[PDB]
Design an enzyme around this catalytic site. Sequence first.
Site, short mmCIF file in Angstrom:
data_model
loop_
_atom_site.label_atom_id
_atom_site.label_comp_id
_atom_site.label_asym_id
_atom_site.label_seq_id
_atom_site.Cartn_x
_atom_site.Cartn_y
_atom_site.Cartn_z
N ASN A 116 4.64 -1.05 9.63
CA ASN A 116 4.25 -1.34 8.27
C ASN A 116 5.14 -0.65 7.28
OD1 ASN A 116 2.67 0.83 6.52
ND2 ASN A 116 2.29 1.37 8.65
N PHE A 120 2.50 2.39 -0.27
CA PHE A 120 1.40 2.93 -1.07
C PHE A 120 0.93 1.90 -2.11
CE2 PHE A 120 1.36 6.81 0.97
CZ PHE A 120 2.06 7.89 0.45
N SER A 186 4.45 9.76 4.70
CA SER A 186 4.70 8.32 4.68
C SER A 186 6.20 8.04 4.79
CB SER A 186 4.15 7.65 3.41
OG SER A 186 4.52 6.28 3.37
N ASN A 188 7.55 5.39 3.92
CA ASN A 188 7.79 4.19 3.09
C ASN A 188 7.88 4.48 1.60
OD1 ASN A 188 7.65 2.45 5.42
ND2 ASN A 188 5.42 2.59 5.35
N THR A 189 7.94 5.76 1.24
CA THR A 189 8.18 6.19 -0.14
C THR A 189 9.40 7.13 -0.10
OG1 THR A 189 5.86 5.94 -0.92
CG2 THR A 189 7.23 7.43 -2.22
N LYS A 226 -0.94 16.18 6.15
CA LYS A 226 -0.59 15.16 7.12
C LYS A 226 0.93 15.09 7.29
CE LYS A 226 -1.67 10.53 8.62
NZ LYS A 226 -2.50 9.30 8.41
N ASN A 255 1.32 11.00 11.22
CA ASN A 255 1.60 9.72 10.60
C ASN A 255 2.40 8.84 11.54
OD1 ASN A 255 1.92 7.78 8.41
ND2 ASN A 255 1.76 9.50 6.95
C1 LIG Z 1 -1.20 -0.82 8.04
C2 LIG Z 1 -0.94 0.68 8.04
C3 LIG Z 1 -1.06 1.36 6.83
C4 LIG Z 1 -1.16 2.76 6.80
N1 LIG Z 1 -1.29 3.43 5.58
C5 LIG Z 1 -1.43 4.80 5.56
C6 LIG Z 1 -1.59 5.50 4.37
O1 LIG Z 1 -1.85 4.91 3.30
N2 LIG Z 1 -1.73 6.86 4.43
C7 LIG Z 1 -1.66 7.57 5.59
O2 LIG Z 1 -1.79 8.79 5.56
N3 LIG Z 1 -1.50 6.91 6.78
C8 LIG Z 1 -1.39 5.53 6.75
N4 LIG Z 1 -1.23 4.87 7.94
C9 LIG Z 1 -0.95 5.71 9.14
C10 LIG Z 1 -2.25 5.92 9.96
O3 LIG Z 1 -3.17 6.68 9.24
C11 LIG Z 1 -1.97 6.68 11.25
O4 LIG Z 1 -1.48 7.97 10.90
C12 LIG Z 1 -0.95 5.95 12.15
O5 LIG Z 1 -1.15 4.54 12.13
C13 LIG Z 1 -1.06 6.38 13.63
O6 LIG Z 1 -2.34 6.05 14.13
P1 LIG Z 1 -2.59 4.67 14.94
O7 LIG Z 1 -1.58 4.57 16.04
O8 LIG Z 1 -3.95 4.83 15.52
O9 LIG Z 1 -2.63 3.45 14.09
C14 LIG Z 1 -1.14 3.48 7.99
C15 LIG Z 1 -1.02 2.81 9.21
C16 LIG Z 1 -0.91 1.42 9.24
C17 LIG Z 1 -1.06 0.77 10.59
O1 LIG Z 2 1.61 2.74 2.52
C1 LIG Z 2 2.40 2.85 3.49
O2 LIG Z 2 3.44 2.17 3.58
C2 LIG Z 2 2.21 3.88 4.57
C3 LIG Z 2 1.83 5.16 4.24
C4 LIG Z 2 1.72 6.10 5.27
O3 LIG Z 2 1.39 7.26 5.00
N1 LIG Z 2 1.97 5.74 6.54
C5 LIG Z 2 2.37 4.49 6.83
O4 LIG Z 2 2.64 4.17 8.02
N2 LIG Z 2 2.48 3.58 5.85
#
Ligand SMILES: Cc1cc2nc3c(=O)[nH]c(=O)nc-3n(C[C@H](O)[C@H](O)[C@H](O)COP(=O)(O)O)c2cc1C
Ligand SMILES: O=C(O)c1cc(=O)[nH]c(=O)[nH]1
Length: 366
Positions: A116, A120, A186, A188-189, A226, A255
């Site tokens: 992804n 944000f 993140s 992505n920023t 985080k 993350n």
């Molecule tokens: C669609 C997508 C959007 C995410 N957005 C955020 C975010 O806004 N802030 C954040 O701290 N982590 C974000 N994450 C990261 C997740 O919180 C997590 O740290 C990461 O996906 C690893 O866990 P997972 O393998 O169970 O999905 C996002 C993950 C995905 C899949």
């Molecule tokens: O908003 C996102 O692009 C995003 C934020 C984040 O903290 N982690 C991530 O995988 N995506």
Amino acid sequence: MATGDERFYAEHLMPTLQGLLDPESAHRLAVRFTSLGLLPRARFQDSDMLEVRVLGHKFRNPVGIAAGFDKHGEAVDGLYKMGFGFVEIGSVTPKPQEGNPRPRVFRLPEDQAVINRYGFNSHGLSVVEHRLRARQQKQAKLTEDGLPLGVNLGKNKTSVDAAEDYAEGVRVLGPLADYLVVNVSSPNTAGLRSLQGKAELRRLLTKVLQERDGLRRVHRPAVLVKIAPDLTSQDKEDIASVVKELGIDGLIVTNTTVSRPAGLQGALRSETGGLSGKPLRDLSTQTIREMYALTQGRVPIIGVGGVSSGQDALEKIRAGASLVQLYTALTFWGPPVVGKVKRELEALLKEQGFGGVTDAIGADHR
Ligand SMILES: Cc1cc2nc3c(=O)[nH]c(=O)nc-3n(C[C@H](O)[C@H](O)[C@H](O)COP(=O)(O)O)c2cc1C
Ligand SMILES: O=C(O)c1cc(=O)[nH]c(=O)[nH]1
Ligand SMILES: CC/C(O)=C(\C#N)C(=O)Nc1ccc(-c2ccc(F)cc2)c(C(=O)OC)c1
């Protein structure tokens, strides 16, 4: 029984959904569907073995929804109904923002992974503040019953002072959060992950904790940081030091990864963004392991990355996590994954001679 539901979602429902909608549309639908609480309550009853006390709170089970599913706090109640022991919303930015152009979420079904680059997308603090205020006393009761709420804070793309963005977040949503997360990881920023360096991090976190400490005692959340799975040894050693020095309440580890582990099969594996899911799992577990050692087991860790089973959860717990989260597993297995993880975790804990989750925390180090 629960296995029949698991199979239905895993083999029929989720693949059909993944056939009809693009990943983002699926995400948006799931948030909408989950917010209405349309799905019936999860059958699994949480045993006392699964209760954890950490971060100034009781958690009736150690399995939470990771940040990113519910960025805007729209589905919190529906997520507790699904059986999560805690819910983290966000990331939330001070001002509303679009995020990156679409397409920005990619499935890697062969890898059980997602990439992804949302960037944000956020309704912003004010919208989210009001949404949480509308249900504030409901949450007070949930929390007292062992179902806490976390708020993950981000920063605006165009912001001049990162620390002031996080400070604003602390001020506006801290009073509504059981814990706050400073998301410095993140992928992505632009520039964000460099907030993880020692000098910046100490400056940032001092400002954050100072703002937190200025809130009235009954509305004063724990503050967690985080971190990425992509840190150097120097980075991690530096984070551990700063966290100990400043008295940060915990870490979320980790993350998504900007790496692309060898062996990814998905067609979309070279898309820009954070990779999540199964290929992240052991990289996250190892980061948990290292951070727990570097902090001498004294700093609570929420473990996240590639959790899709009870074994996955216990591995992170035994590495040092007090709690775990998942997100990506939901996109392949659906809601039944939550009960699956809890049931299997409980069985494994008995099997390995732990009275409960708490006894397993950090066990690999002992
Ligand atoms: C669609 C997508 C959007 C995410 N957005 C955020 C975010 O806004 N802030 C954040 O701290 N982590 C974000 N994450 C990261 C997740 O919180 C997590 O740290 C990461 O996906 C690893 O866990 P997972 O393998 O169970 O999905 C996002 C993950 C995905 C899949
Ligand atoms: O908003 C996102 O692009 C995003 C934020 C984040 O903290 N982690 C991530 O995988 N995506
Ligand atoms: C990574 C973005 C993303 O969320 C997806 C993708 N791709 C995705 O499929 N999400 C997704 C899709 C479907 C569901 C879901 C399935 C059945 C149901 F009754 C309620 C929600 C969920 C869910 O359980 O959320 C709590 C998440």
